Amino acid sequence: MLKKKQLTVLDLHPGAGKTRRVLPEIVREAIKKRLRTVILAPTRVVAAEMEEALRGLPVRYMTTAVNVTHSGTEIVDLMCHATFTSRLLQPIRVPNYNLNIMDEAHFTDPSSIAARGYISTRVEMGEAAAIFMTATPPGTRDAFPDSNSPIMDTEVEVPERAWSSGFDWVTDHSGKTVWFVPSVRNGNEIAACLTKAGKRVIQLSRKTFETEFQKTKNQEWDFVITTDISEMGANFKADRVIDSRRCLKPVILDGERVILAGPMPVTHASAAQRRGRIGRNPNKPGDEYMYGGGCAETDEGHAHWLEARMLLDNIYLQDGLIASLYRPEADKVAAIEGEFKLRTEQRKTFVELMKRGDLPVWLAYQVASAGITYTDRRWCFDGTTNNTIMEDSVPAEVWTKYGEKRVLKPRWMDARVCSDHAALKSFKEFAAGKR
Ligand SMILES: Cc1cccc(O)c1NC(=O)c1ccncc1F
């Protein structure tokens, strides 16, 4: 498993012990063989759970998720998937790891897809070994995998809006429920409906994840309302999962704008991960999984795979060679390897727009490829009238860095910069020259 040119997919069922049992065994064997090793966690929450499983072993934590005492002689590094991809893109030296271990290797965020591409290409080249740990590898068609204890699976209509009647089963429950919603906005309406009925609700999303997830451990709750981010190793002490079976899909229209299409069906892998939150305790059988729709391969044509290609085109591998996507997910995008390769100065702008600007990959690429410099925000105001960003059904307005009030109307429109209140507030700060 640890030999050069080998890529292993450890596909044990959810809760089988990949992180708490198998990962430390692998790390001990890698240290015995003096293999320079990287361990990739999807989120800071998973990184903290990994430190608990690896405690005592000499691991260098390159994350603020944990607070440990290092010796300086560690040959095993632990960081998030995004940090690995960010460091590859930046003019920072990244060691050429002998062993590459990716936990929750099903993560479909662009930086995770790019990390799999870079790693698998190095393995194909005969330069490294890799282990991708996931219950749902790319291409899985089983939404109902094995579990530690039996699960009651029920197809039922699940609310996507506030309700006044017809869903008594939702509130008549006395346990703890994890409910997967298609978006932050949809979660706000369901959470408000449950709060008015006397329930204690915690909401989770990408931006608020580490902070709000702590509340699931620090206080008593009845419902957790979450987006797809909780498919990546987030663990709960719950007895039911309510799953809309829906997600939003970023889609590039006419190569010129990004829209959030849907809500549409989740993939079989996402459905199995959502369901996999329960049935984890062998002593507590009969955890419930209520699902409100079917599965479909909605990852085909999804912007994240095109965005992973933009990132891989700008990562040095060897001379002019460019890393390919991991083979089981390489057909999700019709992109040409190297088509997004930028020249030195535009590449630096592209990286800064993502790292400091916090812009989506696609949008960062349009601005950098147009030859615009990082601090030049004229593009946020000179787009076509149909690119006007709306706030409360009226054009959103910002004071520019020049002191002038202007309508927010970006030259390139990406729906992710204004999908919720928090996102639009961050984009207005960017358009104003505040970061
Ligand atoms: C070693 C390293 C290299 C580069 C970036 C990093 O973020 C770290 N980690 C720490 O400084 C660190 C984190 C957590 N606990 C102790 C620690 F020293």
Side-chain angles (χ1 to χ4, degrees), residues 60-70 87:
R60 175 157 51 237
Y61 294 85
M62 300 172 53
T63 170
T64 45
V66 83
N67 184 18
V68 301
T69 306
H70 291 134
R87 293 175 79 92

PDB file of all heavy atoms in Angstrom, residues 60-70 87, ligand 1:
ATOM      1  N   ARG A  60       3.391  17.096  12.229  1.00  0.00           N
ATOM      2  CA  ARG A  60       3.503  18.543  12.168  1.00  0.00           C
ATOM      3  C   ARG A  60       2.175  19.082  11.654  1.00  0.00           C
ATOM      4  O   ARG A  60       1.758  18.766  10.537  1.00  0.00           O
ATOM      5  CB  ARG A  60       4.675  18.950  11.268  1.00  0.00           C
ATOM      6  CG  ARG A  60       4.821  20.457  11.017  1.00  0.00           C
ATOM      7  CD  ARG A  60       6.250  20.837  10.633  1.00  0.00           C
ATOM      8  NE  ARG A  60       6.739  19.995   9.551  1.00  0.00           N
ATOM      9  CZ  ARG A  60       7.830  19.241   9.611  1.00  0.00           C
ATOM     10  NH1 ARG A  60       8.622  19.286  10.679  1.00  0.00           N
ATOM     11  NH2 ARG A  60       8.156  18.452   8.594  1.00  0.00           N
ATOM     12  N   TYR A  61       1.474  19.832  12.508  1.00  0.00           N
ATOM     13  CA  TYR A  61       0.153  20.376  12.199  1.00  0.00           C
ATOM     14  C   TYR A  61       0.275  21.750  11.581  1.00  0.00           C
ATOM     15  O   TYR A  61       0.644  22.715  12.251  1.00  0.00           O
ATOM     16  CB  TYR A  61      -0.737  20.394  13.465  1.00  0.00           C
ATOM     17  CG  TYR A  61      -1.061  18.999  13.959  1.00  0.00           C
ATOM     18  CD1 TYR A  61      -0.184  18.315  14.788  1.00  0.00           C
ATOM     19  CD2 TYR A  61      -2.168  18.315  13.484  1.00  0.00           C
ATOM     20  CE1 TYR A  61      -0.437  17.006  15.185  1.00  0.00           C
ATOM     21  CE2 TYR A  61      -2.432  17.006  13.877  1.00  0.00           C
ATOM     22  CZ  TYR A  61      -1.559  16.354  14.719  1.00  0.00           C
ATOM     23  OH  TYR A  61      -1.805  15.055  15.078  1.00  0.00           O
ATOM     24  N   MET A  62      -0.014  21.838  10.294  1.00  0.00           N
ATOM     25  CA  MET A  62       0.022  23.088   9.556  1.00  0.00           C
ATOM     26  C   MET A  62      -1.411  23.613   9.392  1.00  0.00           C
ATOM     27  O   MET A  62      -1.875  23.846   8.274  1.00  0.00           O
ATOM     28  CB  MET A  62       0.702  22.860   8.212  1.00  0.00           C
ATOM     29  CG  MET A  62       2.138  22.355   8.389  1.00  0.00           C
ATOM     30  SD  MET A  62       2.997  21.837   6.893  1.00  0.00           S
ATOM     31  CE  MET A  62       2.776  23.295   5.870  1.00  0.00           C
ATOM     32  N   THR A  63      -2.100  23.776  10.528  1.00  0.00           N
ATOM     33  CA  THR A  63      -3.477  24.248  10.635  1.00  0.00           C
ATOM     34  C   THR A  63      -3.689  24.915  12.009  1.00  0.00           C
ATOM     35  O   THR A  63      -3.080  24.487  12.993  1.00  0.00           O
ATOM     36  CB  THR A  63      -4.468  23.072  10.430  1.00  0.00           C
ATOM     37  OG1 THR A  63      -5.797  23.509  10.759  1.00  0.00           O
ATOM     38  CG2 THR A  63      -4.128  21.844  11.281  1.00  0.00           C
ATOM     39  N   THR A  64      -4.558  25.960  12.091  1.00  0.00           N
ATOM     40  CA  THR A  64      -4.843  26.550  13.422  1.00  0.00           C
ATOM     41  C   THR A  64      -6.014  25.832  14.133  1.00  0.00           C
ATOM     42  O   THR A  64      -6.423  26.263  15.204  1.00  0.00           O
ATOM     43  CB  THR A  64      -5.019  28.071  13.388  1.00  0.00           C
ATOM     44  OG1 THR A  64      -5.850  28.431  12.289  1.00  0.00           O
ATOM     45  CG2 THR A  64      -3.696  28.813  13.316  1.00  0.00           C
ATOM     46  N   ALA A  65      -6.524  24.729  13.563  1.00  0.00           N
ATOM     47  CA  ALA A  65      -7.585  23.913  14.149  1.00  0.00           C
ATOM     48  C   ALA A  65      -7.170  23.288  15.481  1.00  0.00           C
ATOM     49  O   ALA A  65      -8.026  22.968  16.303  1.00  0.00           O
ATOM     50  CB  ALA A  65      -7.937  22.797  13.196  1.00  0.00           C
ATOM     51  N   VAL A  66      -5.874  23.040  15.655  1.00  0.00           N
ATOM     52  CA  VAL A  66      -5.374  22.402  16.859  1.00  0.00           C
ATOM     53  C   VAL A  66      -4.250  23.241  17.491  1.00  0.00           C
ATOM     54  O   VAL A  66      -3.683  24.120  16.839  1.00  0.00           O
ATOM     55  CB  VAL A  66      -4.943  20.955  16.508  1.00  0.00           C
ATOM     56  CG1 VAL A  66      -3.542  20.916  15.915  1.00  0.00           C
ATOM     57  CG2 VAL A  66      -5.059  20.041  17.710  1.00  0.00           C
ATOM     58  N   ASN A  67      -3.969  23.008  18.775  1.00  0.00           N
ATOM     59  CA  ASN A  67      -2.907  23.719  19.470  1.00  0.00           C
ATOM     60  C   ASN A  67      -2.029  22.651  20.113  1.00  0.00           C
ATOM     61  O   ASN A  67      -2.419  22.045  21.113  1.00  0.00           O
ATOM     62  CB  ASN A  67      -3.488  24.670  20.514  1.00  0.00           C
ATOM     63  CG  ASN A  67      -2.441  25.499  21.210  1.00  0.00           C
ATOM     64  OD1 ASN A  67      -1.307  25.638  20.738  1.00  0.00           O
ATOM     65  ND2 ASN A  67      -2.797  26.066  22.353  1.00  0.00           N
ATOM     66  N   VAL A  68      -0.882  22.359  19.484  1.00  0.00           N
ATOM     67  CA  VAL A  68       0.023  21.290  19.912  1.00  0.00           C
ATOM     68  C   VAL A  68       1.464  21.793  20.110  1.00  0.00           C
ATOM     69  O   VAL A  68       1.801  22.903  19.701  1.00  0.00           O
ATOM     70  CB  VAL A  68      -0.003  20.148  18.854  1.00  0.00           C
ATOM     71  CG1 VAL A  68      -1.407  19.587  18.673  1.00  0.00           C
ATOM     72  CG2 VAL A  68       0.570  20.635  17.526  1.00  0.00           C
ATOM     73  N   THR A  69       2.316  20.974  20.742  1.00  0.00           N
ATOM     74  CA  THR A  69       3.722  21.295  20.933  1.00  0.00           C
ATOM     75  C   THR A  69       4.528  20.454  19.937  1.00  0.00           C
ATOM     76  O   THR A  69       4.489  19.232  20.019  1.00  0.00           O
ATOM     77  CB  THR A  69       4.131  20.951  22.364  1.00  0.00           C
ATOM     78  OG1 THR A  69       3.242  21.603  23.280  1.00  0.00           O
ATOM     79  CG2 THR A  69       5.570  21.327  22.657  1.00  0.00           C
ATOM     80  N   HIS A  70       5.227  21.090  18.988  1.00  0.00           N
ATOM     81  CA  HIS A  70       6.021  20.357  17.998  1.00  0.00           C
ATOM     82  C   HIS A  70       7.475  20.160  18.466  1.00  0.00           C
ATOM     83  O   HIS A  70       7.963  20.903  19.324  1.00  0.00           O
ATOM     84  CB  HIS A  70       6.018  21.086  16.637  1.00  0.00           C
ATOM     85  CG  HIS A  70       4.698  21.074  15.935  1.00  0.00           C
ATOM     86  ND1 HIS A  70       4.171  22.222  15.370  1.00  0.00           N
ATOM     87  CD2 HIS A  70       3.834  20.053  15.728  1.00  0.00           C
ATOM     88  CE1 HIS A  70       3.013  21.863  14.841  1.00  0.00           C
ATOM     89  NE2 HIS A  70       2.763  20.574  15.041  1.00  0.00           N
ATOM     90  N   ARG A  87      -0.803  26.372  -1.193  1.00  0.00           N
ATOM     91  CA  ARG A  87       0.654  26.364  -1.120  1.00  0.00           C
ATOM     92  C   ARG A  87       1.278  25.945  -2.441  1.00  0.00           C
ATOM     93  O   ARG A  87       2.273  26.538  -2.836  1.00  0.00           O
ATOM     94  CB  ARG A  87       1.141  25.534   0.076  1.00  0.00           C
ATOM     95  CG  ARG A  87       0.747  26.218   1.387  1.00  0.00           C
ATOM     96  CD  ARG A  87       1.101  25.397   2.607  1.00  0.00           C
ATOM     97  NE  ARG A  87       2.521  25.511   2.941  1.00  0.00           N
ATOM     98  CZ  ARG A  87       3.021  26.409   3.785  1.00  0.00           C
ATOM     99  NH1 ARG A  87       2.221  27.289   4.384  1.00  0.00           N
ATOM    100  NH2 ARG A  87       4.321  26.432   4.043  1.00  0.00           N
TER     101      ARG A  87
HETATM  102  C1  LIG B   1       4.377  24.198  11.642  1.00  0.00           C
HETATM  103  C2  LIG B   1       3.580  25.077  10.716  1.00  0.00           C
HETATM  104  C3  LIG B   1       4.081  25.406   9.460  1.00  0.00           C
HETATM  105  C4  LIG B   1       3.379  26.226   8.598  1.00  0.00           C
HETATM  106  C5  LIG B   1       2.126  26.688   8.947  1.00  0.00           C
HETATM  107  C6  LIG B   1       1.588  26.362  10.187  1.00  0.00           C
HETATM  108  O1  LIG B   1       0.372  26.824  10.567  1.00  0.00           O
HETATM  109  C7  LIG B   1       2.327  25.578  11.082  1.00  0.00           C
HETATM  110  N1  LIG B   1       1.739  25.255  12.325  1.00  0.00           N
HETATM  111  C8  LIG B   1       1.933  25.854  13.520  1.00  0.00           C
HETATM  112  O2  LIG B   1       2.585  26.883  13.661  1.00  0.00           O
HETATM  113  C9  LIG B   1       1.237  25.209  14.693  1.00  0.00           C
HETATM  114  C10 LIG B   1      -0.111  24.884  14.584  1.00  0.00           C
HETATM  115  C11 LIG B   1      -0.734  24.276  15.654  1.00  0.00           C
HETATM  116  N2  LIG B   1      -0.111  23.973  16.791  1.00  0.00           N
HETATM  117  C12 LIG B   1       1.190  24.237  16.878  1.00  0.00           C
HETATM  118  C13 LIG B   1       1.891  24.837  15.855  1.00  0.00           C
HETATM  119  F1  LIG B   1       3.209  25.078  16.002  1.00  0.00           F
END
